[PDB]
Amino acid sequence: EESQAFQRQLTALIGYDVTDVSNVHDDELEFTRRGLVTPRMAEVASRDPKLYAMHPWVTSKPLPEYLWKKIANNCIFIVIHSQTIKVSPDDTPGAILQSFFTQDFVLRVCGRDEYLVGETPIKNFQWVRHCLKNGEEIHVVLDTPPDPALDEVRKECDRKFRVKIRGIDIPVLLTVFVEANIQHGQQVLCQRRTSPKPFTEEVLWNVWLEFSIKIKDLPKGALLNLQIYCVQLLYYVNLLLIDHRFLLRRGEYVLHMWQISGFNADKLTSATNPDKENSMSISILLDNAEMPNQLRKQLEAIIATDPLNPLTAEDKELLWHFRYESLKHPKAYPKLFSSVKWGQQEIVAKTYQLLARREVWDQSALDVGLTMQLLDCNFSDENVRAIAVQKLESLEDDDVLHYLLQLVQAVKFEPYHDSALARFLLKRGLRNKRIGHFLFWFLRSEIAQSRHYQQRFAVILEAYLRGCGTAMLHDFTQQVQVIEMLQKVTLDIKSLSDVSSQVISQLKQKLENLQNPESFRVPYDPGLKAGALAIEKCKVMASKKKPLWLEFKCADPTALSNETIGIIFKHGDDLRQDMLILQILRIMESIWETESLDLCLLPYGCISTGDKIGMIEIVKDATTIAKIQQSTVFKDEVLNHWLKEKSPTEEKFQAAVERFVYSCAGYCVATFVLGIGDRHNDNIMITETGNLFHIDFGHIRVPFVLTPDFLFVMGTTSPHFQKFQDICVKAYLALRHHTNLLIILFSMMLMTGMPTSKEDIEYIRDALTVGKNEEDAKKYFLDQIEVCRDKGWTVQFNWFL
Numbered sequence: 144e145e146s147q148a149f150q151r152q153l154t155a156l157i158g159y160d161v162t163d164v165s166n167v168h169d170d171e172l173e174f175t176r177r178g179l180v181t182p183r184m185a186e187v188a189s190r191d192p193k194l195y196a197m198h199p200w201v202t203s204k205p206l207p208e209y210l211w212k213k214i215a216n217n218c219i220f221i222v223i224h225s226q227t228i229k230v231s232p233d234d235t236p237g238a239i240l241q242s243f244f245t246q247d248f249v250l251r252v253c254g255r256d257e258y259l260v261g262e263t264p265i266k267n268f269q270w271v272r273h274c275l276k277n278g279e280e281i282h283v284v285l286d287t288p289p290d291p292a293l294d295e296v297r298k299e300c301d302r303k304f305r306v307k308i309r310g311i312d313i314p315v316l317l318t319v320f321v322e323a324n325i326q327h328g329q330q331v332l333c334q335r336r337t338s339p340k341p342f343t344e345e346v347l348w349n350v351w352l353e354f355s356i357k358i359k360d361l362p363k364g365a366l367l368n369l370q371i372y373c374v375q376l377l378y379y380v381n382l383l384l385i386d387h388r389f390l391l392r393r394g395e396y397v398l399h400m401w402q403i404s405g406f407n408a409d410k411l412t413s414a415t416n417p418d419k420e421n422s423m424s425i426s427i428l429l430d431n432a433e434m435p436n437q438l439r440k441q442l443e444a445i446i447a448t449d450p451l452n453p454l455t456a457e458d459k460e461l462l463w464h465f466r467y468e469s470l471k472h473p474k475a476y477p478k479l480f481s482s483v484k485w486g487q488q489e490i491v492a493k494t495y496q497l498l499a500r501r502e503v504w505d506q507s508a509l510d511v512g513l514t515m516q517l518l519d520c521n522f523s524d525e526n527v528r529a530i531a532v533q534k535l536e537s538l539e540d541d542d543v544l545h546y547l548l549q550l551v552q553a554v555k556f557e558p559y560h561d562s563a564l565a566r567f568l569l570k571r572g573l574r575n576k577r578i579g580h581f582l583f584w585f586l587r588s589e590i591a592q593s594r595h596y597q598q599r600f601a602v603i604l605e606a607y608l609r610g611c612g613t614a615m616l617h618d619f620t621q622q623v624q625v626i627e628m629l630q631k632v633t634l635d636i637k638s639l640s641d642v643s644s645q646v647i648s649q650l651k652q653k654l655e656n657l658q659n660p661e662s663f664r665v666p667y668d669p670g671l672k673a674g675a676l677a678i679e680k681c682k683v684m685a686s687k688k689k690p691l692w693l694e695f696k697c698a699d700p701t702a703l704s705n706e707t708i709g710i711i712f713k714h715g716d717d718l719r720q721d722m723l724i725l726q727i728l729r730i731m732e733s734i735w736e737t738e739s740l741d742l743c744l745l746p747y748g749c750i751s752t753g754d755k756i757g758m759i760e761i762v763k764d765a766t767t768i769a770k771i772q773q774s775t776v777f778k779d780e781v782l783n784h785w786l787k788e789k790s791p792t793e794e795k796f797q798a799a800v801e802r803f804v805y806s807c808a809g810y811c812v813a814t815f816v817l818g819i820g821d822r823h824n825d826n827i828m829i830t831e832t833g834n835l836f837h838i839d840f841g842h843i844r845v846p847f848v849l850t851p852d853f854l855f856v857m858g859t860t861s862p863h864f865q866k867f868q869d870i871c872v873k874a875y876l877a878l879r880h881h882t883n884l885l886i887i888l889f890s891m892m893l894m895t896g897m898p899t900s901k902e903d904i905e906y907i908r909d910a911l912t913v914g915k916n917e918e919d920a921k922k923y924f925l926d927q928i929e930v931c932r933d934k935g936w937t938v939q940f941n942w943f944l
């Protein structure tokens with residue numbers, strides 16, 4: 144019937160068929176599809192239609208200091224379409240409108256689908272704060288509120304554990320054996336191997352592997368991890384010993400395994416390879432007083448350490464024995480729940496009784512860095528994860544948007560498809576259209592290039608789409624259609640090809656043919672809508688990847704400016720890594736705002752849409768530093784010359800120098816903390832207004848980039864180089880303040896986004912001077928600056944080969 148065409152539309156929007164049972168040895172995905180219907184409706188019938196439709200983008204955080212200094216009269220001016228209006232920072236949109244009259248109309252941003260509504264002071268609107276920071280005028284049209292009826296929803300034993308390894312079978316391709324582990328949160332409880340047999344297209348053991356753990360000592364979320372060794376590891380697969388119904392798993396299983404490439408999240412997935420034609424297969428059978436002072440100081444020293452500091456046996460024994468003393472410190476929860484012998488039923492019962500009375504945790508101030516630790520790979524126990532999701536529950540929509548991408552990624556560490564974190568993301572994306580849009584796109588990015596997790600993400604995405612609303616369904620449909628057309632064009636043009644006459648001819652020809660998709664919401668900026676193509680401005684960038692440089696017209700006639708919307712379609716670069724780096728940059732900007740800092744980072748929008756294919760935003764009036772040097776020529780005087788050229792007034796040039804010092808310090812600190820500071824001059828752009836910023840972080844000696852050209856822009860010691868060295872240490876110590884959060888986000892990004900062992904992660908710990916006084920860390924960063932000085936253009940020149 145038509146309710147089936149609705150499901151076909153859902154499939155087309157998802158990129159994967161959630162009704163397909165071709166790759167399932169149980170009903171877990173459908174069980175989760177059915178279990179999600181309750182939270183979906185619960186959030187749908189509970190959301191305010193008016194505020195949901197207008198989705199005001201608001202924050203409760205105070206107005207920073209650097210933004211107060213820009214309103215030196217306590218008078219914000221709102222231009223309504225048209226007259227200007229004086230307003231107080233604490234003046235509500237309702238008060239503003241009723242003072243404009245002296246009844247039902249609403250103020251909507253000009254050239255955007257954004258609204259300044261709700262019982263919030265204009266001081267607390269993100270659009271207003273963006274205008275203030277960038278010195279822009281608040282233009283708004285008096286429009287009629289959008290119809291909430293458009294968001295209407297289409298209503299819907301003591302015996303030891305034994306495993307029979309029968310054999311392996313592969314029609315593809317030494318000696319090979321089978322290793323069967325019982326993992327819980329990457330903790331191997333017991334391990335058993337088989338005897339090494341000749342590696343052939345069919346190896347039968349018919350062997351009972353007898354484990355050391357008892358049946359009733361198995362914890363929920365425990366994985367039977369089956370791997371094949373040749374000594375190297377070639378194939379891996381996972382089975383949930385306790386399923387979504389708390390039933391010990393029994394029966395015959397023919398599991399198609401994943402192959403290894405020559406640690407990361409994909410090695411943990413309960414999904415099996417859907418390529419049953421080529422993939423290796425495995426066949427198995429299942430049939431079954433208070434402390435003294437010295438110890439207190441030791442325990443506090445333990446709790447105080449960083450997330451990456453490993454716990455020794457004595458440390459874990461100490462944490463467990465004084466578990467009730469450790470429960471008073473929220474900072475010790477990760478290290479406390481790692482000392483648990485999860486392969487013992489009595490100890491897990493004790494752990495649950497401990498979780499029973501956790502007043503100090505419930506009352507503690509929300510700590511995101513402490514929640515992420517409990518949501519990462521090390522914790523399989525669903526109650527331990529549920530306490531972290533509980534702490535997330537209190538985040539405002541702005542903070543959810545801050546950590547949305549990495550929480551979506553953290554969904555990969557959930558043992559079961561139906562998880563508290565999944566339900567939280569569903570609720571929060573249904574409660575806000577902006578969270579919903581970015582959730583859609585992150586889930587779709589993962590569904591489109593991850594066989595390990597496409598099924599779970601597709602179930603979640605369908606659950607969301609069922610409640611997001613018919614209007615948003617239309618929006619997403621338009622966006623998907625447009626991106627698909629554009630990626631087809633990108634791939635064809637990349638096949639055809641520096642640049643050829645025929646290439647430009649064909650590009651403009653295909654763009655003219657394609658335009659006959661009237662308007663679509665910009666995926667990386669849901670406030671913006673793009674209309675017709677400006678074909679004259681469309682080109683092929685002549686990069687090694689031959690990406691598409693497209694420019695659109697804004698479909699909103701209320702838009703004041705005539706600037707086009709610039710997008711770059713790119714195949715060849717893995718843009719999931721770029722998304723992760725940009726999101727961490729936004730997180731660093733937030734950490735700096737906490738201390739009234741603004742290093743003017745330019746985290747341009749970027750969305751990964753498929754395997755090594757994505758889209759990138761195009762910032763205003765920006766060019767590469769290496770290009771600036773090529774123009775006039777290795778020469779350091781060139782950057783200030785270009786700045787003078789592009790800035791008309793002397794005052795504008797000084798403002799550009801200020802902005803440059805700020806953005807340069809920001810990117811220096813960030814790129815050092817993340818280990819992507821040693822960059823080619825070609826991958827560092829700057830805006831005509833002096834704003835510097837790095838690009839293309841995909842697939843990525845000196846600590847960072849501070850070449851003598853930037854220094855000449857600073858003048859060298861000079862009065863502004865001193866400002867540089869000052870802002871640097873300021874922001875660096877600000878980040879060291881959030882050291883733990885930065886480390887946990889770094890490790891999660893490495894696990895869920897990069898090709899990743901222990902050594903890779905510790906670079907961030909070293910760069911953040913873990914266990915160092917702030918003075919010594921400041922001296923360390925100044926030494927890094929001095930290294931940048933001493934090296935000069937040696938590495939820059941070296942790259943040229």
Ligand SMILES: CC(=O)c1ccc(-c2sc(NC(=O)NCCC(=O)NC(C)(C)C)nc2C)cc1
Pocket residue numbers: 686690694706707708709710711713747759760761762763764765766838839
């Ligand atoms: C190598 C690669 O993959 C890659 C390279 C550069 C970018 C760019 S380019 C840019 N900004 C810009 O080029 N501004 C001048 C043109 C302009 O007028 N654009 C309007 C009309 C205002 C839309 N930002 C970024 C992030 C991305 C990706």
